[PDB]
Amino acid sequence: GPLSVFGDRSTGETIRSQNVMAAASIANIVKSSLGPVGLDKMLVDDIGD
Amino acid sequence: TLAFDEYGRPFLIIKDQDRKSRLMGLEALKSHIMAAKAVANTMRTSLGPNGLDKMMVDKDGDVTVTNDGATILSMMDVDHQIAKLMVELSKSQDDEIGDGTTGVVVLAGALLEEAEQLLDRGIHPIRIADGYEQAARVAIEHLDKISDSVLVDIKDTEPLIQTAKTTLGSKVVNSCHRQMAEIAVNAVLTVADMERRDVDFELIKVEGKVGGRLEDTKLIKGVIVDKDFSHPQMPKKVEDAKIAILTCPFEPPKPKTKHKLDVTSVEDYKALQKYEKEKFEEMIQQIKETGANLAICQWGFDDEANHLLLQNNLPAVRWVGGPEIELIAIATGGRIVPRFSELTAEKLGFAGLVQEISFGTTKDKMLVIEQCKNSRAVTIFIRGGNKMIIEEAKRSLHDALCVIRNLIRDNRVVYGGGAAEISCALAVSQEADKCPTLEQYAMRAFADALEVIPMALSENSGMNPIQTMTEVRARQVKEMNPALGIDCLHKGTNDMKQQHVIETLIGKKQQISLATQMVRMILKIDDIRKPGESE
Amino acid sequence: RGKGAYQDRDKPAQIRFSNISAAKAVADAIR
Amino acid sequence: APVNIFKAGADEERAETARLTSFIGAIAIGDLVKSTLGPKGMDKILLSSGRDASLMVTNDGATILKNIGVDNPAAKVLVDMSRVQDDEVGDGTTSVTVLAAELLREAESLIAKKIHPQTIIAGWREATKAAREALLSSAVDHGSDEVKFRQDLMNIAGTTLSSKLLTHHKDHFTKLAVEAVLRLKGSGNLEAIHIIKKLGGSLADSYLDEGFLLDKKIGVNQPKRIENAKILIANTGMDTDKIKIFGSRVRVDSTAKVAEIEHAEKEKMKEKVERILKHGINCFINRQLIYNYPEQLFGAAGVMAIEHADFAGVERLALVTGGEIASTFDHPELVKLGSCKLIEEVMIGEDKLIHFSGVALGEACTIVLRGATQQILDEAERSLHDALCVLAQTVKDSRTVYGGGCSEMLMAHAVTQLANRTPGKEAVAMESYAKALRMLPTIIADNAGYDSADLVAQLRAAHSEGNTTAGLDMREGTIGDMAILGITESFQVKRQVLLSAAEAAEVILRVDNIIKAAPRKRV
Amino acid sequence: APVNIFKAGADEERAETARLTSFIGAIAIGDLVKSTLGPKGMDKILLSSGRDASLMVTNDGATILKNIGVDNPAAKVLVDMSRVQDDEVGDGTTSVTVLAAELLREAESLIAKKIHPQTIIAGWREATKAAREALLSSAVDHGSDEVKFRQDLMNIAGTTLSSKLLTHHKDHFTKLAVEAVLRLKGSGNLEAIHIIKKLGGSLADSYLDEGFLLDKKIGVNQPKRIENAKILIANTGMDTDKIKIFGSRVRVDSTAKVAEIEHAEKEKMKEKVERILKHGINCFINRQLIYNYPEQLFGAAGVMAIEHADFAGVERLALVTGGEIASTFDHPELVKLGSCKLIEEVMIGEDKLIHFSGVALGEACTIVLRGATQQILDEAERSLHDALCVLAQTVKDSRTVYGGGCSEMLMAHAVTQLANRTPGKEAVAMESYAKALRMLPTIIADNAGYDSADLVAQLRAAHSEGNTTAGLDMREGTIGDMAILGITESFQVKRQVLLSAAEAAEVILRVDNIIKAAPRKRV
């Protein structure tokens, strides 16, 4: 009947809404570090750096 | 993303959303058709007189071989909500008419298979559903063209027998195809109220006992109960029975409240012995003063009352059921008496040969009522070689009792064997061009799905579907359309009027009406919100 | 007469529909 | 339905494994009890895994199939088929199981021939109709001339007991089975012949009692034997009556009135026994229990008292003595008493039983089965039950047919004669019906060790030109006349073997889909 | 041996489940490939559970059984039987599997008849001896009059390719198979016909090349086409020789002597190429790899250089050009060169191959199979391999028999004529041998959907009185003459179907005990 792939398939407006939230997840991070009133961040690693 | 927001917060809408299943897509309609076609392909092989039966096993290990479409889909463990609606579709045909429970599932799966190719062309699913309503309306009006019956329930039982042979021809009762067909005709006409056109199936008792053969099934005018003569020396044959039906146990009268009767002296204890000794002589004499020679009691008997039955020559049965004695008072014309003091000669029942019959080596000894006087209650005694052939004959003959009931509700008939489906398919194709504005493709998908039922009869009979259907459909256009179908041994010609394949009008009228509305509820759905695992 | 009857009680009538339904899912995936 | 399965734990199959599991499960049932068919077939011993296994050896095909518990769905139809055969005629439960399995084995041969299964059903319905006329036209009736009917009844019991454990006891057990039904002189109730199984002694030491045997010996201080007595039985309560008034207490003011009530209770129990001895009796049988207060009253009057025999024990005493139950004692002129000669107690297997020797109107018997083990007594009881049930229906239907393979070749000849007057669509299914009827003398011939390929070929050549009474002689291993050797069976037994196997094979052959549901508590 | 078992993890069975598992496991092999027999039979698709499953559709019965991996012990005898049939004659691997299974299916019918299994073996040895005389007396030889032998060879390839995927390609693929063996003009080595499978195009676009195709294209700066050239091949090392003295070093005192040694190494490698071009050649094929230093020497002289074709690629070039391998270059008067006309490069499926057009003494071919998918190319290669192997043996043994069911009815008639001249002990085994030979035209007739119950019955009535060339016509669905329609098979192919199935059924029927040992790493 359906596709017999062993992975995962998502069609329609599901991925069309997921790619915007994937791009907005990156833009909402770097929005606080733009311009002369922007502020720096902290990038802490698992090893402690 | 799912279960997380773009700001890092957890995104939870409903509870346990990770173990949910939701499909809107374009395959949500495709999953409903592939689940419904597999039910229709299962029921396709059990259609017609050459339809092969199915073996159903219950959860307890009991095996029942069924052929009717109502009991097949009901005894499944299908956990699919689209196929569960096909179970209630075959149940709705059994509750209303009760003859086309197999054909209403193949027709519903045929409308969804033709709608699959219409869905890929870009047609809206409600536009197909609105096109099926305008196409099924033509099939209802065309089915009422040729319809006539001459049943008078006096001597013209010949249209009634040939109507029941169409229903019993597909079951396993074809060895008794003439004997058992006449049983279901006379069982309805003796209990039906022709002034109201109402038939009550509570008056038709269907009992079964293993032993004998299928040819030993007789229509017993009366009642058949388990006889429980408390005395083993009771006479087992009454020639003329004045039946005294009572609902009081043969005992001293016990009240319904708490009494705690007090005994003080020895004169009160000797009064206890004379009270019960005169009570058992009063309950026996009040039956003999009415002239009765047979008693029926719902409750038990006392040991002191058992020997008083033999001294007065009064046979009596013990521990009869609730609705069983309700059938005795109608078959014998008597009245059910609450007490013993209200017994009279007018409340007695009349019966002829009252006897018990032992079946082989068992100890059942069922009641056989041969003679009666204007009874309104009959009992069919189904015998067979095993319990598989009896429980199926209880389901096969019940479909034969329903098609006679539908003739009293509506005295119009059609001709089966695929003759009515080909004639209705030509009516939709003629009105598809008047006018082919929007719903031209939806009406032609209805006419191509109406031809699945006669081409399934050609497949089960060993013929070719597209070769036999093209010959029958072309002969109805070149001349005026007769009752032209098919058969298994084909009986020579293909004329259904000569082969006496007669079906009810309202049977096929509800086959097209219920399958169209069930298709509309499974086409007008674009989401599934089923859960995941059980726990 | 019916001029014969060819009873085909075997497997691959159902597997032939399995190859059809699987190829329809591929054509509808890249549609 | 296998593709995109919409079931939870249930599985199904359509036209591929449906008829495959139906033909495997039904042949393996028929091949199981194949070795128990015939006068030289062996027996089975049935055992469980434990927890009071209760081993029960049986040769009858109904008792084997009712205890195995087959998990196959189509095999339960043949199990239920042999259950009705034991309940209706009591014989041929093994013969109806092999015949229904040989029909489906010939139907499995029609799988590769591409025959439609509805054509085999229509071909077997015409074959069964031709086989009913073969048994009906060959049935031998017996009206008057009763010295030939009693000789015919010994051929029925001699044929049934030859296929059981009672092989070399046909000189005794045939007389124990014919005279038991002959003493009924009426309807075949099949409960007046009370079979008592006692250990010790051989099967030749078993006998039919001329009177009646019972348990629950005569009182404490009562006489053990009374000559020329009048037997009165009862079904009434003796002591601790609590007579039919629920919600009645003894509410007194002093304890001296309680002594007057309990003396008045014992006076009414004494007056009830005084109403019993006004009939002039010497023995008393009560279905209920007799306590100590009426037991002293019967012992002082010299009257026996048999307490709590059985619920069906007073029914057999009413048929062997000629009395009535008489649960109420208020009219001595309307109560008929029994008759006997000796009520002495006999000892059978170190157990004292009450022997009702010399009874009048004795329409009841008592078979005293004595065997080496309990396994022999459980087999000889079912072997005698398979012989008494046929003789109880042979006196109701006196039509008899010639058994020993002679009836099966008469049925197979009528099908083959009408198979040549049919077109080739249904003629192949009728030839498979006649081949399965010839398998029933083939199983009997091969169980003894004879040449089954030649003896059935000699039976088919004999029945093709005359010889309507020619059958299989299992004594010497040849073909002989069945009217001379005296190997006959009942007509209703041989009809139910043919008719129930044709109906049961019709159900399984019409199955194209086996949809079994998900079972409970099986993981 | 089951009772008081003296084994650790091994089990066995004797005479009850030994022949039961042998008859179930062998029929299920024969009923599997039953649907692939005949010119209207379907094909199978073989798949694994994963881990490079490599799906390979095959209709030939040898390739199906060699990849399924049956766990049954007796089924591996029939699996190995079809492997030998593919290795000897290359055809009839499906026909020998069903025939060996139909012998054991008739031997399962002799279980209930109580026939001794050694009587069935001795009955089949006389039946197989009579069946050899039916094929030997009906074989049609072809000596002179070669215009009727080439028409007879196209009937062999037309019958073999009719039961494969090449159904509607008999107008093309018959000429590709007959002319491939006809261009050998000698022994059937079955390796000069190199089949090249390329994607793109239909099966009608496939063709037989008039020359020869190769890979590993001509150098870097070498000419791509030379007209009227002399082809010289080789099997020698070009560069980095390390010539045959293990334990030889260059032990010098300064690095200036290493420059003189490596210049002396390149002078001897240049002198080796100068000995090659003294023959007067234009093309060079080396089985080993050609490095950069001799590649510049062949490019400067205008000589081609084909490096590392194949180990068996220089054998096909030696048979298509008429030369020799010539691994040593020291005698130009004793080295025979090849001959060609065009060595142009052709492009088949976006791949440039070297076309040896116009070669002399071309006893080698190249079939360029073009298909829609790789599954068709893997099936058409095995379909052509099953067609070229029969024509390679038909030119060695010109005896041909009439196929299409005509040969099996001739073999079954000779057994039935001698089944009536035998005593009844072995006559029943010979009748089962003749019924199994008639199943082979029954499987072909039922695969198309025809009435197999009537067509084989008409073939038995035709062969009973004359009609030695009457067979089954699968085109219209009737009975026709096989000499007119031209449906013939080879005698050695039909003999190995009869002989190997009778020997393999002799082994499995003689097994009464299957003692399987404890397997390793299975728990």
Ligand SMILES: Nc1ncnc2c1ncn2[C@@H]1O[C@H](COP(=O)(O)OP(=O)(O)O)[C@@H](O)[C@H]1O
């Ligand atoms: N003698 C006959 N000739 C042709 N067709 C027949 C004959 N008898 C029955 N049929 C067909 O067989 C079908 C059986 O339908 P059935 O399964 O009984 O419907 P339901 O399940 O609603 O009872 C009918 O539609 C009828 O047209």
Ligand SMILES: Nc1ncnc2c1ncn2[C@@H]1O[C@H](COP(=O)(O)OP(=O)(O)O)[C@@H](O)[C@H]1O
């Ligand atoms: N003396 C005899 N000669 C020939 N055949 C006999 C003789 N006695 C019994 N048989 C055969 O043995 C068979 C026994 O069948 P049985 O197992 O009793 O059937 P069921 O189980 O239905 O009672 C009968 O069919 C009968 O024909």
Ligand SMILES: Nc1ncnc2c1ncn2[C@@H]1O[C@H](COP(=O)(O)OP(=O)(O)O)[C@@H](O)[C@H]1O
């Ligand atoms: N044109 C034809 N007419 C009749 N029969 C044919 C024709 N072509 C092939 N056949 C039959 O089909 C069968 C195919 O057998 P095959 O599967 O090739 O055997 P194997 O696997 O041993 O090569 C042959 O036995 C042959 O008799």
Ligand SMILES: [Mg+2]
């Ligand atoms: Mg019906």
Ligand SMILES: [Mg+2]
């Ligand atoms: Mg018996």
Ligand SMILES: [Mg+2]
């Ligand atoms: Mg071949």
